[PDB]
Structures are given as C-alpha cells and as structure tokens.
Amino acid sequence: NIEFRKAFLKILHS
Amino acid sequence: NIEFRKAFLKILHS
Amino acid sequence: PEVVEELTRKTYFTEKEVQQWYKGFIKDCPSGQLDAAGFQKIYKQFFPFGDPTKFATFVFNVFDENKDGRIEFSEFIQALSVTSRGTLDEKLRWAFKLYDLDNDGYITRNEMLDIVDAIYQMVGNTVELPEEENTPEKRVDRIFAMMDKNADGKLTLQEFQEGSKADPSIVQALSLYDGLV
Ligand SMILES: [Ca+2]
Ligand SMILES: [Ca+2]
Ligand SMILES: [Ca+2]
Ligand SMILES: [K+]
C-alpha cells in the first residue's frame, strides 16, 4: 500500500 | 546544500 | 494480544498505534517478514528514476537488528519508534548506526563516501547541487574533515553528534534534519 509505505518513509526521511 | 532535503520533502509528500 | 503489550512497553507508541502500524505492515507484507529485496522495491516506488538499491540496503541493515536478513514487525516498530519519537541523542545514535557500515563504533571516510554515494545514486538525478558539492567525494571531503576533530580518519559517535548539530545539512537525507535545524 503506497500510503502505508509513504507514511513510514516520511518518518525516516521527511 | 539542503537540496536532497528539499527533494525528499516533495518526493514523499502526503 | 499479549505481544502488543510488550511492544507498547518497548516503544514510544500506544497500543492502538502499535496495532495500527501492524495492520499496515501485515497488509503490505502478508508473510510478516520483509527482506532486502522487498525493501528496495519499496524505495523504488518513490524513487523510480534512480538506483535506490544501495541506500535501501544500508537502511535495511539498521532495521535488521538481529542480522537475520529479514525485518520482523518488532524491528520495524522499534526503528520507527526511535526515529520519530526518540530523544535527539537516540535519533543521532540511529543515524550513526546507518553510517557505521561495519559496526565497529567508527565512521570512516570510506564508510561515509559509500552512504553519500548511495544517496546520490538514489536521488541525485532530481536535485541541482552547487558545483563545489556535485559529487560524493567533494561533499565528503568537506564534511568529513569538518567532523574529524582528532584528525584520525575515523568519526566517533560524539564527533558525529557534535558535527551534525553544527551543520544539520550533514544528515539532510534524514528526518533528523528537522530536529537539528
Ligand atoms: Ca531481523
Ligand atoms: Ca565503521
Ligand atoms: Ca576522529
Ligand atoms: K548526503
């Protein structure tokens, strides 16, 4: 799921 | 530079 | 159930938060265990016009605390707990582990060059860098000499912590930047 994947990448990188 | 920072913020927008 | 409780104790998340993340995790990876390949695919979605292989793997290795070639949910949630809600010290220690590839307590110039190269490979295509910093080598020469106060070619945790507070751009690829800026 792109919104799940986006959410955790944001925690790491955004 | 903070160009990668700016990129991440756009690329991982939500 | 009983395990939610333990992971709630071990992280800065509430039970409902642990479970919400678990739902997402397991829906995204039904086997409950994601490997370096799956992880690279995840970055590839968001960075399709670059080669994210290297950086994804370096990040994967920090997640895989037990070094068994997989990220189980406990490792996944702990990584997120630290990077989103840890103390500034804890977040800096996490980023240090990312750079400290051989895990010997030091970041060498070579180790940092690898990390910075991986970032350029993943995202370099999309940014426009000032000419003096348009290669990994140029960038690292400056920031590594800045940080290496013992002039010994190896950065301690303290040197990396003090270096990043002074110049937050050193970790511009990480959310940690916003805690330092
Ligand atoms: Ca593991
Ligand atoms: Ca090392
Ligand atoms: Ca040193
Ligand atoms: K960088």
Numbering used by the authors:
A (entry chain B), B (entry chain C): 430 to 443
C (entry chain A): 10 to 190
Paste lines from the article:
Neuronal calcium sensor-1 (NCS-1) is the primordial member of the neuronal calcium sensor family of EF-hand Ca2+-binding proteins. Here, we report the determination of the crystal structures of Rattus norvegicus NCS-1 in complex with peptides derived from D2R and GRK1, as well as the structures of NCS-1 alone and in a C-terminal truncated form.
Diffraction data were collected from crystals of rat NCS-1 in complex with the D2R peptide, and the structure was determined to 2.19-Å resolution. The complex adopted a different crystal form from the NCS-1 structure without peptide bound, with one NCS-1 chain in the asymmetric unit. The most striking feature is that NCS-1 binds two copies of the D2R, one in the N-lobe site (referred to as peptide D2B) and the other in the C-lobe site (peptide D2C). Both peptides bind as amphipathic helices, with D2B forming a slightly longer helix than D2C. The two peptides are bound with their C termini pointing toward the center of the NCS-1 molecule. Hydrogen bonds between Gln-181 of NCS-1 and Asn-430 of D2C orient the peptide such that it binds in the opposite direction to D2B. In the uncomplexed protein, electron densities for Val-132–Leu-138 are missing, implying that this region is unstructured; in the presence of D2C, the region immediately after EF3 adopts a short 310 helix (Gly-133 to Thr-135), and electron density for the loop is now defined. When D2C is bound, the C-terminal region switches to a “U” shaped conformation comprising two antiparallel 310 helices, Pro-177–Val-180 and Ser-184 to Gly-188, connected by a turn made up of residues Gln-181–Leu-183. In summary, two molecules of the D2R peptides bind in the hydrophobic crevice of NCS-1, with the most significant conformational changes observed in the EF3/EF4 linker and the C-terminal region, which adopts a helix-loop-helix conformation in the complex.
